[PDB]
Amino acid sequence: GRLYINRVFHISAERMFELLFTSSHFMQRFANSRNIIDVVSTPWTVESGGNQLRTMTYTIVLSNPLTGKYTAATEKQTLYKESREAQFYLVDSEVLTHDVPYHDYFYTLNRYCIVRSAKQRCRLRVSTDLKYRKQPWGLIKSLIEKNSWSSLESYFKKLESDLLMEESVLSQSIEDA
Numbered sequence: 001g002r003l004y005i006n007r008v009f010h011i012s013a014e015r016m017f018e019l020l021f022t023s024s025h026f027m028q029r030f031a032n033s034r035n036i037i038d039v040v041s042t043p044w045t046v047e048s049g050g051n052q053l054r055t056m057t058y059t060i061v062l063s064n065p066l067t068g069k070y071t072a073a074t075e076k077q078t079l080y081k082e083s084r085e086a087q088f089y090l091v092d093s094e095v096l097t098h099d100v101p102y103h104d105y106f107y108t109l110n111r112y113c114i115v116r117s118a119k120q121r122c123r124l125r126v127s128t129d130l131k132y133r134k135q136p137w138g139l140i141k142s143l144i145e146k147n148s149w150s151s152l153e154s155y156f157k158k159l160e161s162d163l164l165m166e167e168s169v170l171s172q173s174i175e176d177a
């Protein structure tokens with residue numbers, strides 16, 4: 001679909017994963033700045049396949065005249081079995097909206113890839129794709145496209161800006177010790 005973040009940070013692959021995929025204060029501050037409230041999540045849970053599973057719910061406060069003031073959302077995060085601690089993290093995040101128009105007809109798939117670059121460095125790669133169900137006809141999908149890609153771009157750029165500010169204070173704190 002679209003590649004929104006491709007960057008090497010001066011944060012370890014371990015710390016980057018715990019920043020993004022645990023109930024970190026970093027994520028709480030970032031979600032608030034994006035008007036995402038009432039974040040509820042699970043711990044990472046193992047299943048028979050070997051992959052790990054984490055699910056979240058939250059409410060997105062919307063600025064769209066075509067939508068209501070709020071929409072419920074559900075996120076299912078899949079950490080693939082191929083991941084190795086502090087070395088390689090590959091998460092597939094599927095996001096469902098529940099109160100926007102045509103919410104039954106599409107969802108979003110975000111793939112997060114964290115690979116350790118050096119000793120305290122990592123490369124984060126986030127790609128985004130829209131998925132469709134029930135075969136939305138004609139005008140429905142073009143409306144979905146024009147009301148998603150720009151909001152997803154705005155979302156992940158603010159995350160990259162916050163990760164860079166995090167990199168600047170965390171790498172300094174580690175280096176100074």
Ligand SMILES: CC(C)CCCC[C@](C)(O)[C@H]1CC[C@H]2[C@@H]3CC=C4C[C@@H](O)CC[C@]4(C)[C@H]3CC[C@@]21C
Nearest residue numbers: 060066095100101102108143144147148151152155
């Ligand atoms: C047809 C037309 C009336 C639809 C308009 C309303 C749709 C929204 C509001 O335009 C949706 C579409 C994609 C939705 C985003 C998809 C993925 C994520 C990543 C996750 O971490 C945090 C929530 C977030 C940013 C979702 C936010 C809500 C988005 C942006």
